[PDB]
Amino acid sequence: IGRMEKALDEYVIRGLRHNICLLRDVVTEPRYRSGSITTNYLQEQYPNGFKKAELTAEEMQLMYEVAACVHLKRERLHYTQGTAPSERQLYLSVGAGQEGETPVYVRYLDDSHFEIGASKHGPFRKMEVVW
Amino acid sequence: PTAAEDLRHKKKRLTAMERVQLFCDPGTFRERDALVEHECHNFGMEKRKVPGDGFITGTGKVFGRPVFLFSHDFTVFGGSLSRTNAAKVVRIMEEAAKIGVPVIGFNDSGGARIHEGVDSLAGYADIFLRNTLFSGVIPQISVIMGPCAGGAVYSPAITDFTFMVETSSYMFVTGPEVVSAVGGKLVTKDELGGPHVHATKSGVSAGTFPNDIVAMAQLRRLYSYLPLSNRDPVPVLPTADERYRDVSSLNTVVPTEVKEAYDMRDVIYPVIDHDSFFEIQPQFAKNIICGFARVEGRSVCIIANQPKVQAGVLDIDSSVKGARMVRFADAFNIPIITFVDVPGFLPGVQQEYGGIIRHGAKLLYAYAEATVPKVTIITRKAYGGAYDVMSSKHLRGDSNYAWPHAEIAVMGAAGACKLLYSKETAEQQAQRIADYEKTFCTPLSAARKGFVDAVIDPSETRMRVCEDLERLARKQLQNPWKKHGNIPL
Amino acid sequence: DVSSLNTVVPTEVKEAYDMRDVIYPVIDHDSFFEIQPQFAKNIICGFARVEGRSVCIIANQPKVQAGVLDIDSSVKGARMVRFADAFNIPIITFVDVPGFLPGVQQEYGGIIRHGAKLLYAYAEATVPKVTIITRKAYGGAYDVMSSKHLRGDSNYAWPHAEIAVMGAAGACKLLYSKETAEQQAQRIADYEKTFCTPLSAARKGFVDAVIDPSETRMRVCEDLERLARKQLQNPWKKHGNIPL
Ligand SMILES: O=CCCCC[C@@H]1SC[C@@H]2NC(=O)N[C@@H]21
Numbered sequence A: 001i002g003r004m005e006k007a008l009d010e011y012v013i014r015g016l017r018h019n020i021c022l023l024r025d026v027v028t029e030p031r032y033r034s035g036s037i038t039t040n041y042l043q044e045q046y047p048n049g050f051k052k053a054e055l056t057a058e059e060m061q062l063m064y065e066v067a068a069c070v071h072l073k074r075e076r077l078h079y080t081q082g083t084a085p086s087e088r089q090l091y092l093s094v095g096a097g098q099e100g101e102t103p104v105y106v107r108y109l110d111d112s113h114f115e116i117g118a119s120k121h122g123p124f125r126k127m128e129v130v131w
Numbered sequence B: 001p002t003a004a005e006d007l008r009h010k011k012k013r014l015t016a017m018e019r020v021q022l023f024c025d026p027g028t029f030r031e032r033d034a035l036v037e038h039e040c041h042n043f044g045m046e047k048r049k050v051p052g053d054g055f056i057t058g059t060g061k062v063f064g065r066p067v068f069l070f071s072h073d074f075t076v077f078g079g080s081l082s083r084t085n086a087a088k089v090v091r092i093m094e095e096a097a098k099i100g101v102p103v104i105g106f107n108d109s110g111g112a113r114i115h116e117g118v119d120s121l122a123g124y125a126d127i128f129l130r131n132t133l134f135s136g137v138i139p140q141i142s143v144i145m146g147p148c149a150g151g152a153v154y155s156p157a158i159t160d161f162t163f164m165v166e167t168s169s170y171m172f173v174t175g176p177e178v179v180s181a182v183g184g185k186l187v188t189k190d191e192l193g194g195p196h197v198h199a200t201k202s203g204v205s206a207g208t209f210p211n212d213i214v215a216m217a218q219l220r221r222l223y224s225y226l227p228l229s230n231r232d233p234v235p236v237l238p239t240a241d242e243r244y245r246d247v248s249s250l251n252t253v254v255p256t257e258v259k260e261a262y263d264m265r266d267v268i269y270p271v272i273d274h275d276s277f278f279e280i281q282p283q284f285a286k287n288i289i290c291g292f293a294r295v296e297g298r299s300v301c302i303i304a305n306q307p308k309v310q311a312g313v314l315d316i317d318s319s320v321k322g323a324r325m326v327r328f329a330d331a332f333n334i335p336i337i338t339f340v341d342v343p344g345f346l347p348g349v350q351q352e353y354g355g356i357i358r359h360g361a362k363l364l365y366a367y368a369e370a371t372v373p374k375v376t377i378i379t380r381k382a383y384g385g386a387y388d389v390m391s392s393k394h395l396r397g398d399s400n401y402a403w404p405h406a407e408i409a410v411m412g413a414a415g416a417c418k419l420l421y422s423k424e425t426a427e428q429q430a431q432r433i434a435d436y437e438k439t440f441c442t443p444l445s446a447a448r449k450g451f452v453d454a455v456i457d458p459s460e461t462r463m464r465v466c467e468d469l470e471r472l473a474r475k476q477l478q479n480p481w482k483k484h485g486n487i488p489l
Numbered sequence C: 001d002v003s004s005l006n007t008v009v010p011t012e013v014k015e016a017y018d019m020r021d022v023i024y025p026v027i028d029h030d031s032f033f034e035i036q037p038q039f040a041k042n043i044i045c046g047f048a049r050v051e052g053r054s055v056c057i058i059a060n061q062p063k064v065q066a067g068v069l070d071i072d073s074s075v076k077g078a079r080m081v082r083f084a085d086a087f088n089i090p091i092i093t094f095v096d097v098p099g100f101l102p103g104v105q106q107e108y109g110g111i112i113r114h115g116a117k118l119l120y121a122y123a124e125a126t127v128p129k130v131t132i133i134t135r136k137a138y139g140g141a142y143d144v145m146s147s148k149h150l151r152g153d154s155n156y157a158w159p160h161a162e163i164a165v166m167g168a169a170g171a172c173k174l175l176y177s178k179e180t181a182e183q184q185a186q187r188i189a190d191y192e193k194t195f196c197t198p199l200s201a202a203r204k205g206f207v208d209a210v211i212d213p214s215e216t217r218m219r220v221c222e223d224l225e226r227l228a229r230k231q232l233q234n235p236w237k238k239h240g241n242i243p244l
């Protein structure tokens, strides 16, 4: 299953819609991983239309961190020669109303390594992003 | 400390200094002049002097490259110009003329300052002359953040590109009060000169943005494309994308039926680098696309027809749009890449009553006068004078290519069959139109004459374009000596 | 960090100071090569480096003769400016002048010819120029020492500067012919307060900005880096006709 989970996310499809979200949500459901299912499983678990499951706090935090890293990496490309920055303090907030402003730092110690933290003078984790 | 700007933000609007701070780098703005007064002494203006005098001019720095800018201030006197406001702008433009640096201005003026008399006209004239002289020397970009009325509208017009903000901006020559006075019609300011009107109807505005923040964010991206001056070379940026990336999806873009339509962006996007298109005038004359893009890390100019809208037929507005884009691109040594799909010109009385002859000649003049490297690709068809206009090989074109299902003919098969057989026996349609289209509506004849270099598979377009654009990097061509041309206005 | 420049200028207008205390912090360490050190000591000329590039230095000195322009100083500065411009070398000047040296010997020796040489050299030059007014600039001396109107690139002043037509006494005398006696006390002070300050010259637009003395190195490096590629040309001539 884990393999499928991972393999679903690496399938790049552009130009038309698909049902990969439904497959992902069905596989990730703890009912499906319980061990047994039924033939009325789908409509039993999807009474009104279809609604994809949401994200937990840590997943949304990780998405924020990766977004900040990507922003910094693409920003450094446009600068000329060595006149480029290496650290910022960003304020990420999804939604049109800035729901949950989360301050973020970034350091870009190498080509594919950062020092993400809460802000300046905050403990750093040194994750990795390759894009 | 957030003093004196609470009144501004309460109206859901930003300040000039905040806009300047958002545009440039975090700490690289050096305000030039800050303690200047109007010295008017008329109509009870001897009092209420202001330190900044309603203008903010500085130098700044974007992406490590220098810039010059100025911003109007709406709080102070409504942003009106004077004998003294225009002096700062003139000094900035003169300095940016000595050094090869561009100029960007954020217009917010409410009109002229009446209390100065004709001195406002003097300042306007000086700014107009500087814009006229320095156009083609340094790129000029203008953004309109608020009201812009009176005769001040003309200086943004001479500038290369004008952008507009959606909710709280407008521009026109004469106010609606005079329109009501003379004609008797009641029209609001937005109905007269709103951003939508200039985006779709008049064709003056080159774009529209939803917010000031987005305006700055994308203005930086636009600035990343431009060359610094007239004599400086085209910028080249590092990029991980490579010319060996596979593009085989182009083999299927063109439908096998001649009456079905397709989107030209499906051809434009694969050739250029990923996520590197900046469309210019997206909502005006949609049958033609113009903008900037990068090919192997160097900025180029894109001009292509679109059979999605009106069968990709040339027109007045499309001609003006393409002509302006080509002229600007050539003025600053930027390569041009074109994609051709045209059945001809739009037929109609309104067209001749509006002067198609003048307007359609502008694109041809711009294409013929240009001396930058050109690359042309004929995908499906090219008929009549439209084939000549859209950068044909005879107009000193560098390299021309065609796709295996193209067609290059004098006109459609029906008209040729009609003219070639006056009173030939009836039913001549079936056994003559098919034969003529088979024999002469194909790139074989044009290739025999030598009008296309080679017939290529659609999968090799990126390879060919990168090769040619790399080889043509150092072409030196010059026109005969002239004081200047005489373009059909 | 150069914060020692905040204290170089004394708070009294009649006390003297050494201009080298202003010259040395701005340029790089141990990089001054004085030219003609023992002749016309009221003016200093030489070569120096700013951020690794050679520049030309021309500054007055209130230590010697109140920093007053003269014949010999004019010749020295004119030759230095002409040589520096001939070979595309940036020029940086520091201004502190009360005027020209008064005396019969001066007119009997041709001050009119010699003082025009420095003005000609400053006006003819096309290299980037930077000017800093520390304390004062009066009369034609302000015009001669690379004023903004002579196609100067950037001009700066310090917060206690003074730019006026002449001293307060002469202006008060000419502005009130036979005004009631004791006019000295309540007129000279007022005129010096109102017009012997950089506010009026900044209002007219003759100085770009009024800066803290601690930012001089930053401003000079920024301007000299930006001005690296200026291209200016004079009208066509076989050659000039300088006042010999
Ligand atoms: O066959 C009759 C109408 C054909 C029009 C073909 C297109 S429409 C606009 C343009 N002008 C032409 O003469 N041909 C094309």
Ligand SMILES: O=CCCCC[C@@H]1SC[C@@H]2NC(=O)N[C@@H]21
Binding pocket: C068, C098, C099, C100, C101, C102, C167, C169
């Ligand atoms: O007040 C009387 C004498 C003031 C002289 C001030 C200095 S001396 C040389 C130069 N020439 C002037 O007119 N003023 C300065």
